[PDB]
Short mmCIF file of N, CA and C in Angstrom, two decimals:
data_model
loop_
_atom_site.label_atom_id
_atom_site.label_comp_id
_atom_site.label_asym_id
_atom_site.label_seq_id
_atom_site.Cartn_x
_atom_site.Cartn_y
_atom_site.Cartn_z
N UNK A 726 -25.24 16.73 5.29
CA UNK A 726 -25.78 15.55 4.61
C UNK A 726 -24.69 14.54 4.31
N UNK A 727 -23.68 15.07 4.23
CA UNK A 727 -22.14 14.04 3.64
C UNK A 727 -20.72 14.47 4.56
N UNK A 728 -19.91 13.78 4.37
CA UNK A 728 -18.99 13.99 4.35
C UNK A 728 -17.56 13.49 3.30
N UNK A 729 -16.98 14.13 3.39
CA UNK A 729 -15.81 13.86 2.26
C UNK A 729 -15.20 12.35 2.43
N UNK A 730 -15.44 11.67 1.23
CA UNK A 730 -15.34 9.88 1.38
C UNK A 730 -13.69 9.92 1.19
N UNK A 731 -13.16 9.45 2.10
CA UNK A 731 -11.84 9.44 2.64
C UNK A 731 -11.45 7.59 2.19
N UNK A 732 -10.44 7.49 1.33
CA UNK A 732 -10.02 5.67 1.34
C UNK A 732 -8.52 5.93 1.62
N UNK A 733 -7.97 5.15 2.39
CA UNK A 733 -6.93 5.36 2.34
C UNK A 733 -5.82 3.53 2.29
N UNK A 734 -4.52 4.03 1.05
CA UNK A 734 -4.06 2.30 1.30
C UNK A 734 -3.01 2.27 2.52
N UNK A 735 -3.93 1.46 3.35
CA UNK A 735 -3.16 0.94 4.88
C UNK A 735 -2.17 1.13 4.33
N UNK A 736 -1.68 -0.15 3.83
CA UNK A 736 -0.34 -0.69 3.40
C UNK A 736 0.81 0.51 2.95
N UNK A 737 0.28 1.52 2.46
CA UNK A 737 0.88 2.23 1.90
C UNK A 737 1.10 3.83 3.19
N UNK A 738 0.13 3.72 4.16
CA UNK A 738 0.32 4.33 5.59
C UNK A 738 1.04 4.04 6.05
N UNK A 739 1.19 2.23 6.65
CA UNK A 739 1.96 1.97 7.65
C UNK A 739 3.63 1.64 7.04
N UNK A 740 3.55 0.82 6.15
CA UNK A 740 4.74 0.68 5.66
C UNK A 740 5.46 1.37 4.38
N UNK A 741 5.21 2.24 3.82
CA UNK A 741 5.25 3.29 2.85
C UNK A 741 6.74 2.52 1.58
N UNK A 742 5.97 1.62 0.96
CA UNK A 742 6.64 1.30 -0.38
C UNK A 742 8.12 0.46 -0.03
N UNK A 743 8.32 0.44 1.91
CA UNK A 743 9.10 -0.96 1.85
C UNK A 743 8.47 -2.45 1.94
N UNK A 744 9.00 -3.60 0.81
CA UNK A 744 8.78 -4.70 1.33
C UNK A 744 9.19 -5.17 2.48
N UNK A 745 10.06 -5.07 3.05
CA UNK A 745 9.93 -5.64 4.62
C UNK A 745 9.28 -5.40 5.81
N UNK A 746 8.91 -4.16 5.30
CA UNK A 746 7.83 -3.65 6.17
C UNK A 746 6.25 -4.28 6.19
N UNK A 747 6.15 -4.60 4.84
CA UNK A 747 5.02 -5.21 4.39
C UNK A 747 5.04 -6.80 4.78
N UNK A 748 5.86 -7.05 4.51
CA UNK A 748 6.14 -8.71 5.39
C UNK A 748 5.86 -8.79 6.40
N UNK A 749 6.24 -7.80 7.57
CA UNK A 749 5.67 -7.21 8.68
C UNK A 749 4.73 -7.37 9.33
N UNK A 750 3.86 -6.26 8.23
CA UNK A 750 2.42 -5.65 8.29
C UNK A 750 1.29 -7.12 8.34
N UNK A 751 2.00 -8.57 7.27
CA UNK A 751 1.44 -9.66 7.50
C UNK A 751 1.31 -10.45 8.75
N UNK A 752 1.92 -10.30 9.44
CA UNK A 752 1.94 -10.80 11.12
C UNK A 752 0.75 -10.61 12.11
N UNK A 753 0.62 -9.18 11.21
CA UNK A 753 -0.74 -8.48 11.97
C UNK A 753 -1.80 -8.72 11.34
N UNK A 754 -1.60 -9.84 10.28
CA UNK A 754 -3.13 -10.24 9.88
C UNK A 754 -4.36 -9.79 9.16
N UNK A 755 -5.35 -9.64 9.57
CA UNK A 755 -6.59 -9.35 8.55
C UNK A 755 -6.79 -7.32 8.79
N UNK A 756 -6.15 -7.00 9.74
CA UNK A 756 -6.21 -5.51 10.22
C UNK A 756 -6.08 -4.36 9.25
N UNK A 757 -5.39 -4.93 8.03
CA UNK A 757 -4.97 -3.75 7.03
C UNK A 757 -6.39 -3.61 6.05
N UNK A 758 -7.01 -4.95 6.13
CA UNK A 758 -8.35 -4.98 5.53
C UNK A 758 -9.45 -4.29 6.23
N UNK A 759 -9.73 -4.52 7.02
CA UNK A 759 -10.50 -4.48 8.06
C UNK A 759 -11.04 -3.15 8.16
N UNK A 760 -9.81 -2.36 8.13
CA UNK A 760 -9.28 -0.76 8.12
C UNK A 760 -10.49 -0.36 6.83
N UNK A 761 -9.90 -0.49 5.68
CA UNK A 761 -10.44 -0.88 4.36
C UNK A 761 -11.52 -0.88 4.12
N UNK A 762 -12.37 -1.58 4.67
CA UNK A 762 -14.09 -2.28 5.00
C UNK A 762 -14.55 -1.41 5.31
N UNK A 763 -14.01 -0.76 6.77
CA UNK A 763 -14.48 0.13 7.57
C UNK A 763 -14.49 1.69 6.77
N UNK A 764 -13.43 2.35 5.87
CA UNK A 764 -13.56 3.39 5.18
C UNK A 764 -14.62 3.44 3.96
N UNK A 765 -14.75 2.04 3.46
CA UNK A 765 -15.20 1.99 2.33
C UNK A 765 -17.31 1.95 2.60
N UNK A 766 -17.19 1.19 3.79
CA UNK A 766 -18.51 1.34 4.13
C UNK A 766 -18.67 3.28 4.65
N UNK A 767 -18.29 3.88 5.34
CA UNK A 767 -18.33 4.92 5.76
C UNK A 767 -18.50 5.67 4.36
N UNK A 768 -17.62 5.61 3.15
CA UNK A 768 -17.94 6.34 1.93
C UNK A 768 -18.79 6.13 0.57
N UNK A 769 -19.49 4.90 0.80
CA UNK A 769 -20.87 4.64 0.34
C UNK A 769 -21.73 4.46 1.28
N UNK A 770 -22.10 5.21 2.46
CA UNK A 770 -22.86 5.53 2.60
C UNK A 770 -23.33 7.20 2.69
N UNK A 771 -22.19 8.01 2.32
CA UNK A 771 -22.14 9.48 1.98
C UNK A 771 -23.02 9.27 0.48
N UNK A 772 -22.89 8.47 -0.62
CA UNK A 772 -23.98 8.38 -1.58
C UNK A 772 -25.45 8.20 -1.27
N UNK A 773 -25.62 7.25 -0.13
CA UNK A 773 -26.52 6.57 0.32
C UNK A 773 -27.49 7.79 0.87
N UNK A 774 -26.46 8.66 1.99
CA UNK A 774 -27.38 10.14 2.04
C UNK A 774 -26.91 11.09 1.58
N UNK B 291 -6.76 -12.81 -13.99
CA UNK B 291 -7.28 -11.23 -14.98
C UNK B 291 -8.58 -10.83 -14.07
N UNK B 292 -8.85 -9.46 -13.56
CA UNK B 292 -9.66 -8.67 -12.68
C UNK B 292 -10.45 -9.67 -12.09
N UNK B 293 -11.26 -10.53 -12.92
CA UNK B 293 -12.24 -11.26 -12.31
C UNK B 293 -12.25 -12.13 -11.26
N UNK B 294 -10.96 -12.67 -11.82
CA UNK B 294 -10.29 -13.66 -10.47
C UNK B 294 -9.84 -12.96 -9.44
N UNK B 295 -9.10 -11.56 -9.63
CA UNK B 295 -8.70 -10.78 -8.67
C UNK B 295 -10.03 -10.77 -7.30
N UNK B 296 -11.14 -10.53 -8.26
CA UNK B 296 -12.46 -10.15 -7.26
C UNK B 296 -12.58 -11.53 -6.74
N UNK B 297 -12.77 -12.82 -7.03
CA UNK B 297 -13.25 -13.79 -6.73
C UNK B 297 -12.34 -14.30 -5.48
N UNK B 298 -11.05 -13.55 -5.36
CA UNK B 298 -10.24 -13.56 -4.52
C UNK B 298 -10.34 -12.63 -3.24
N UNK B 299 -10.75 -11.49 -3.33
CA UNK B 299 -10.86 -10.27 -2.68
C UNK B 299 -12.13 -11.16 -1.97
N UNK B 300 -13.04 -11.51 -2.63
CA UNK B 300 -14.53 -12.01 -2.36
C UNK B 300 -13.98 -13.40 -1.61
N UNK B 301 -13.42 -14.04 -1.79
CA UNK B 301 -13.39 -15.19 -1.22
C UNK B 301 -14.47 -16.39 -1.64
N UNK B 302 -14.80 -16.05 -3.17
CA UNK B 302 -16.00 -16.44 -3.38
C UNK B 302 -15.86 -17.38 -4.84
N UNK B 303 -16.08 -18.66 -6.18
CA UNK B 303 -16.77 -18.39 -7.03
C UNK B 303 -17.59 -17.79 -8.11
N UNK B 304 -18.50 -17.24 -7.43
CA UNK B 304 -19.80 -16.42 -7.51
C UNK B 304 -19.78 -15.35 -7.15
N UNK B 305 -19.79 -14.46 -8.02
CA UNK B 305 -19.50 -12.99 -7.80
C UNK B 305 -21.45 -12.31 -7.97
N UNK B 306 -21.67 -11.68 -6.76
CA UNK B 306 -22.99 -10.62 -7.32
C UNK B 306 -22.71 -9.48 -8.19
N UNK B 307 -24.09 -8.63 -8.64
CA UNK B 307 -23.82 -7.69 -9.14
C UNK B 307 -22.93 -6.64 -8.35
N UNK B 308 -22.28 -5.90 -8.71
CA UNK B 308 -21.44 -4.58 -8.47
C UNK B 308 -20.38 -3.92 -8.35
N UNK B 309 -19.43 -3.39 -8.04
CA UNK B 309 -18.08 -2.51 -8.27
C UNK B 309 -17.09 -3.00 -6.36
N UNK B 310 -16.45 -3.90 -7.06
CA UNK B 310 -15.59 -4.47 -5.83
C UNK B 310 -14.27 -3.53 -5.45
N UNK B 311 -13.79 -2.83 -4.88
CA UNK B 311 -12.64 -2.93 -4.05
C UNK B 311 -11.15 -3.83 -4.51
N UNK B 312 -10.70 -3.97 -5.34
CA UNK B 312 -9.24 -4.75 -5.43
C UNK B 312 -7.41 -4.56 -4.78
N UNK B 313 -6.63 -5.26 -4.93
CA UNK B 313 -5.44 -5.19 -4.99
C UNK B 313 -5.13 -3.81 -5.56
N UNK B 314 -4.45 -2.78 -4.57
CA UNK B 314 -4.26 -1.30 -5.05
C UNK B 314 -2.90 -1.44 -6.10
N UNK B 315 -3.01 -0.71 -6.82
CA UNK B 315 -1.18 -0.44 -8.10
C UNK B 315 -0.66 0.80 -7.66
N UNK B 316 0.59 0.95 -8.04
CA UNK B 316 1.59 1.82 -7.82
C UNK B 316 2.17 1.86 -9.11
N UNK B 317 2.51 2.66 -9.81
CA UNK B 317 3.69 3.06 -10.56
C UNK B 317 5.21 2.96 -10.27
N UNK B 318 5.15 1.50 -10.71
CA UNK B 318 6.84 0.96 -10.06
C UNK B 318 7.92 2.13 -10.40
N UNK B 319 9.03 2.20 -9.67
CA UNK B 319 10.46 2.52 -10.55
C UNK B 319 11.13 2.42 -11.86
N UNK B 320 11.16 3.01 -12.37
CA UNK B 320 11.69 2.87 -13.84
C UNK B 320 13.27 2.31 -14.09
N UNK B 321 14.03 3.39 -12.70
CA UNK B 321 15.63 2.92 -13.05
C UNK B 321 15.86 3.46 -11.74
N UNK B 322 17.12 3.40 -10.70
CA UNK B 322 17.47 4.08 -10.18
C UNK B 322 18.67 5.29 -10.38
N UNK B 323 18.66 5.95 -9.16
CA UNK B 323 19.22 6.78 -9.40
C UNK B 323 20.64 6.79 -7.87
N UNK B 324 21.69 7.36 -8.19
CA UNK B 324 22.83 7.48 -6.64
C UNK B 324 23.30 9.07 -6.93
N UNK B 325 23.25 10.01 -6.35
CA UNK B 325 24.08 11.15 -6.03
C UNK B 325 24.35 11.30 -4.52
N UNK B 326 25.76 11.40 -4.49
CA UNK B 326 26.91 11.73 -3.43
C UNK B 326 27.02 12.95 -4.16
N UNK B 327 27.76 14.07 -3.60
CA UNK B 327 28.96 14.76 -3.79
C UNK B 327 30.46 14.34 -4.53
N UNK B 328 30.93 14.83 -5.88
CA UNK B 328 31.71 14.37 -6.23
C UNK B 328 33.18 14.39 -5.10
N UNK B 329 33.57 14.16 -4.02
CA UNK B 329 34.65 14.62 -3.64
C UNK B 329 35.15 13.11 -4.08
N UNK B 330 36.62 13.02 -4.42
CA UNK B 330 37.60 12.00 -4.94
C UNK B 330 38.10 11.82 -3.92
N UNK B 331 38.48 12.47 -2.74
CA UNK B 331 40.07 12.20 -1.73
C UNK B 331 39.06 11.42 -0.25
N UNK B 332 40.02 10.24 -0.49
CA UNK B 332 39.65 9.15 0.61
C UNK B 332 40.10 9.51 2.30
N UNK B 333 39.19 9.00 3.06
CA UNK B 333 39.48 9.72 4.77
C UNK B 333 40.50 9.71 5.12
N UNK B 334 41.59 10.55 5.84
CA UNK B 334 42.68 10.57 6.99
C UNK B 334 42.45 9.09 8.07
N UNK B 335 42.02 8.21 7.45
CA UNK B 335 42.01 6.84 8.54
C UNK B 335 43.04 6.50 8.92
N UNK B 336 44.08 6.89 8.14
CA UNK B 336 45.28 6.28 8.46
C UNK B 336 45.90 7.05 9.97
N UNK B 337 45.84 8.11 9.75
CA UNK B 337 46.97 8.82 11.15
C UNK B 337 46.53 8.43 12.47
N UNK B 338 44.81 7.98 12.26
CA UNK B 338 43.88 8.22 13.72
C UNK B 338 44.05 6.52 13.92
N UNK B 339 43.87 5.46 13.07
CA UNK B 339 44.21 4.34 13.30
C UNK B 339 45.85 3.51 13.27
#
């Protein structure tokens, strides 16, 4: 019926607590969100069923 | 203060009813810290250069 609602912070995946990395990570644009959207819809809808 | 945070996240004014997604926190650094090995005696640079 569910599965375990998984969020995870991009930002904190790809570039792990350096700022320059994160300066970076801005180049690539709306993708760290996107990511985001996509987990967050996937774990309300584990409420949903 | 949060609200604006959302109105930002939202891209919006006008916020609907419900529980938004924000800017994630971390528990900054308090102080740092340096451990080396105490050794005192500086390299043999001299004989090799």
């Amino acid at each position: 019926v569910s599965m375990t609602k998984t969020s995870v912070d991009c930002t904190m995946y790809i570039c792990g607590d350096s700022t320059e990395c994160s300066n970076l990570l801005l180049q690539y644009g709306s993708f760290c969100t996107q990511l985001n959207r996509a987990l967050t819809g996937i774990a309300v809808e584990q409420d949903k069923n | 203060d949060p609200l604006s945070e959302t109105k930002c996240t939202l891209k919006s004014f006008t916020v609907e009813k419900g529980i938004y997604q924000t800017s994630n926190f971390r528990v900054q650094p308090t102080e740092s810290i340096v451990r080396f090995p105490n050794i005192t005696n500086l390299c043999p640079f001299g004989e090799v250069f």
